[PDB]
Design a protein around this ligand. Structure first.
Ligand SMILES: O=C(NO)[C@H](O)[C@H](O)COP(=O)(O)O
Ligand SMILES: O=C(NO)[C@H](O)[C@H](O)COP(=O)(O)O
Lengths: 213, 217
């Protein structure tokens, strides 16, 4: 009901895709009975220090880099934990840092440097120190049709938009520390020209338009 | 405009440590600077045993958001939290363990209330490994035996401060960040302290104090 302000589910996806093509961010909500959380998403292709700074200012600050299994393997990033027993099996790899061009790794600029370094299609494992202050996530093969996570949503959006299949995500957080919920996510999107969409929107879009990716 | 001149208003090095200990006993935060030729960063530090949702929320608002839990090696061991990486090649060998979530009493783990729950669960000296799920959204750090007299890091400074204050040896830390995303330096750290009632001290302050009054912790 609140989401209708951003259009019908297909329109909501199209507007998100176009925002990403224009180098802008989007807000992605998962199922209400899952995390019921909204994440800011940026395309790595066009990622700027300003965008990263905004993400740190407005979100959890635990900025994650969503990668394909193939890119994660290229980087030799094993899962952070052999036996993952997190509630949602969040696919955290070992954390990373650019080995060149950063200092402590935590500044907005430094995180962008690390992210650009990792997402590079010609990247090598030795391009990244471990541990670091950027947190890669392995997207499941099949994307949101196989796992209904923001992780898959991020990589799927990039692929659907024709962009570098790597994106950054972080959870929108209210000033008092509680997580933004649907009305706050809607308001944020309207205030800051960021399309809002849901995982279910993406699932319907992909099935409807026969998008194999 | 050197650091010692700027910091003088917080008192002499010994006064600066004594004020930080007092703040922690009163359940307030402190701001800890490491060496200017090291990270040259200021971290907010809180004691775990008095940690509140509001304190955590401030860290999320104003710091990197990668909020770390400084633990003794014994505590990390009882939680089954070895180093995240066998062969750590990060710039200053930051002793990250794998990340953690409370097994019970949290949802996604990332809210201020959830992080506090996870941190208090992890810092409990009777905790068992099954009390935590991995990976998570709280990042534990293994402090070096010997504290700042073994490693001049915020990690050690955090645990040493709790011990010197007579609190349980667990604290949380996060790096203060400027609104433009850059990391806060001594002038901005000083202003933040005076805005948020946090005393400011340095690792060198701590080292000099321990050498004079607390060689063994
Ligand atoms: O918890 C996370 N990051 O720390 C998650 O990657 C993000 O918030 C949502 O992840 P998921 O929806 O793919 O499980
Ligand atoms: O990078 C970190 N945490 O993410 C460090 O724990 C924090 O910046 C201070 O670490 P230090 O113990 O090397 O001074």
């Amino acid at each position: 009901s609140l989401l209708a302000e951003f259009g019908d589910p297909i329109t909501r996806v199209e507007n998100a895709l176009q925002a990403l093509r224009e180098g802008r961010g989007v807000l992605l909500l998962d199922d209400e009975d899952r995390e019921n959380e909204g994440d800011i998403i940026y395309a790595v292709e066009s990622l700027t220090t300003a965008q990263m700074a905004l993400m740190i200012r407005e979100c959890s600050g635990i900025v994650c880099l969503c990668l394909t299994e193939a890119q994660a393997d290229r980087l030799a990033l094993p899962p952070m934990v052999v036996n993952n027993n997190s509630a949602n099996q969040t696919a955290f790899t070992v954390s990373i840092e650019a080995k060149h061009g950063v200092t402590t790794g935590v500044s907005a600029q430094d995180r962008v440097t690390t992210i650009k370094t990792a997402a590079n299609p010609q990247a090598k494992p030795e391009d990244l120190a471990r541990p670091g202050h950027v947190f890669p996530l392995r997207a499941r093969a099949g994307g949101v049709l196989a796992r209904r996570g923001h992780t898959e949503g991020t990589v799927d959006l990039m692929q659907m938009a024709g962009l570098q299949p790597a994106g950054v995500l972080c959870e929108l957080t209210n000033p008092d520390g509680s997580m933004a919920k649907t009305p706050e996510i809607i308001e944020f999107g309207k205030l800051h020209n960021m399309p809002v969409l849901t995982i279910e929107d993406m699932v319907q879009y992909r099935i409807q338009f026969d998008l194999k990716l």
